[PDB]
Every structure is written in C-alpha cells, then in structure tokens.
Assembly symmetry: C3
Homo-oligomer: 162 residues x 3
Amino acid sequence: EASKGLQVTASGVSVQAGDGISVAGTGVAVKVEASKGLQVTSNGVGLNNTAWIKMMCGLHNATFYVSDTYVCVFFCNHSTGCTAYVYGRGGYYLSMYKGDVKLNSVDHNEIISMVGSGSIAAATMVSWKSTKAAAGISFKYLGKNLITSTSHSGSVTLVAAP
Amino acid sequence: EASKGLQVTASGVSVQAGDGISVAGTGVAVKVEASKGLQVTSNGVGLNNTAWIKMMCGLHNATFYVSDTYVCVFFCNHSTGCTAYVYGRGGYYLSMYKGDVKLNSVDHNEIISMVGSGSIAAATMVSWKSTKAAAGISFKYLGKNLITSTSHSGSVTLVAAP
Amino acid sequence: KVEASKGLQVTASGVSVQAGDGISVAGTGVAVKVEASKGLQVTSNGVGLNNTAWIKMMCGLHNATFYVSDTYVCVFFCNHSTGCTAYVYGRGGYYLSMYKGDVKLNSVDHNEIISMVGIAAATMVSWKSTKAAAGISFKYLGKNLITSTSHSGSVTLVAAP
Ligand SMILES: [N+]
C-alpha cells in the first residue's frame, strides 16, 4: 500500500502536496509565494530579478518604495512626514536641487548627500517634513549623471513594500 | 515496481526525501535551512523577513552586526581593531560627533559621513583602532532625524553574522 | 496492476515520481533543484541562499551588468552614454581612494568621482568613454581608517549574474 508522501483517492495513488510543493499532471513542483522574491522555471528555483527590492525595504524598514530605470527610493514615515533612502541606478544619481525631488507634488526639505567635484552632489537621504508616503502617491524627480549634462525627469508612483 | 523518488518498507511505498525535501504523513514539503534566509508556508517558499541581514553581511564581508529600529551596522575586524558600515533605518541616521558612537563603551577613532546642510552629517563608516567586534558586546549610538531635533540614545548588542 | 495519478508516472521501470519545475527525482529520492546561478543552494540541511547571492542583489539594486569583488571592495558597473558609471562599496573595513590616478578601467583613468567625507571614500566613479565588459581590468587603491596600508589592487570584471 501507500504511506508517507503518497495518498489514495478516487483517482488512484498520487503524491500529496505539503508546504512549498505543488502536485499536478506536470509533476511535483516547488511552489513559490508571490511577492517573496523567488521564481521557479524548468531550470529550478532561484531569486527573481526584483528580490533586491524586498531586501532594501528590509534594510531600511521602509513601508513604501519606487523603482525605475534611473533611481530607487525607500520611504519611511516618521514624526509628521517622511524620510527616504535613495539609490541611483543605471549610472544616474538623484539631484539635490530645491525643486528636484517632489512627493505628492510637495518639495523636499532637508537632504543628506554625497559630494562630487565642483558643485556636484548626489542626494542619499531626502525628507519631507509634513508629507507622508502612501501607495499611489506621486514621486517626481530629476536624475543627473557624470558623463553628460542630460537630466532625467521621471514621474512615478509609490508602491507598498513587498 | 516502485522506482525513482519512492522507497519501500514493510509498511508500504512512500516518497523518499532527498535534499531540500521533507516527507511526512501530511505530504511532501520543502525543507529550508534555518539561518539561510528562506521560509516555507502553506503559501509557498520565499525569502524571510531577515534575509537582508545575510545580504548586507555578505556585501561588506562583515562577521558581526547590529540592527534595531534606528540603525543597522556591519562590522569587519582588521588590523588591531575594526571598522563598521552604517545604514540608517526608519528615517533615522547616526550622529557622527566625537562621543556619539561607542563599541564596548570605547569611543571611535575615525568616521566617514554623508553631509547635509550646516552641521548635519550622517555616519557611514566608523572605525576603532584597537577594539574588536565580537558577539555580546554593546554598540551605543545617538540616532537623529531630518524632521525634528529629537535624538535617540540607543544601545544594541552585537550578533554573529548569519 | 497500477492506477497512478498526479505527481507519479509509469514507465517500463515502474512507477516513479514525475519531476516538475524546481524538483529533481533520483534513486536518492525527491530533491529541490535550484537554479545554481540565481543565488540559492540546497544541502542536506535544506534550501537556502548561497554566499554570493548578495552580488545578484547588488547588481539588481543598481541595474548593473558587470561587477568586481575582492576582499577590499566591490563595484557595480552601468554602461550608459559613451562610457560607464559604477557604484562602489567597501569591504573588510576598506574603502576606495578617490585620488585622480587611483581608479582605472581598462587602464584608463576615471573622469568623475562622488564620495563620502571623512579622508574621502569614493561611492560613484565614472569614465566618459570606456565601457564595462567581462574580463577587463579594474585597478584601484584601497585604504582603511586604522592603518596607512595602501592596497593597490587589480581585479577583473565579471558579467552580472
Ligand atoms: N540585498
């Protein structure tokens, strides 16, 4: 007869799926939970290409984020507003100029930066004294780079942490 | 005949558990290794909520760390002492002032920071010339933020990297 | 003789477990199959992250297509415009020096650096007209805050995982 891991029903003998496992006519497979950073293909189980977002939200204890080709931002609500930790992507960094980082269309307050040559400075922590991060709120920013004078003007919306 | 994936005892045919798999009367499940960043629920396999710690320890090749609601820090022992890489959490950052970062009650020797307006500065690397990181000793710090002038005097105990 | 259903298959060798995505089936039993290049491992203790998964995470963070890593520094390179810009993290207590001749890609000196302030530690480094590619050289000087050690290193670029 059948015992551990197998079961008998009207359909005959089958493999009984437990936690992390799917059983179908396509075989016994690993089941990955959506939004927890893994994928599974015919090559096997692995990290997906956005697992790093969950990691950075954990790092900063952020509850909302944005990510596009040129910047990502991890927002923490505290006191009367929000402070976010910024990482450049694709070669870009985030401008620290007065009008260049808006949350819910509100201009930022204090920024902490890293420093380049001349007047170059890259925003790494950005705060809004009286504006909160929330899902669906707009984030409008200007990114810059060190090769050309091109400014990247992006408008995206906040997403809840995974 | 029962063949690959199955095993036979006097009690019948069962699924044989290989690496990463557990088999019980309740079925075939994924087995995750405790300290390696994954979890398994009825919803499937995923990263757990502290996998980011392993990632950051790997990033800096750190052997000890701390994490609380205000800050996390990753320590590398080298020469006669140690150097730590600092990340703010929850919107906070670490004061870089002379008496504001202690390891085992010893004041730091050197700090590298990111810079804000006026005297605002956030510690990003902190070094002690002759104090070693080890599990069970205290890290004391002053957390601050960009919205209010409130400070948090914190104390958190070092833990071995996972 | 047999009435087999989901998860099982029957061949001339008998009834066996049918392997789907993420599963391997052998005489040693049913095991998890990890995609070895995507940061996971499987041992007798179970499935977990391997010790280079952090590199995949950091390439994702910066959308980098090449990197270097040694025990003193890691760098994540993004090709854009006519050149390359890289994001820099210290390792082992070290940091990347920001002097003019201290950071070369394919033997070419950088054009711009962004840094943290101490002493200064480079966090972003850029080359106007040099591209990142696998196998080319990254030559740098690493420093630390305890001693005056000058680590002159040369390391080779690796394709992002
Ligand atoms: N990470």
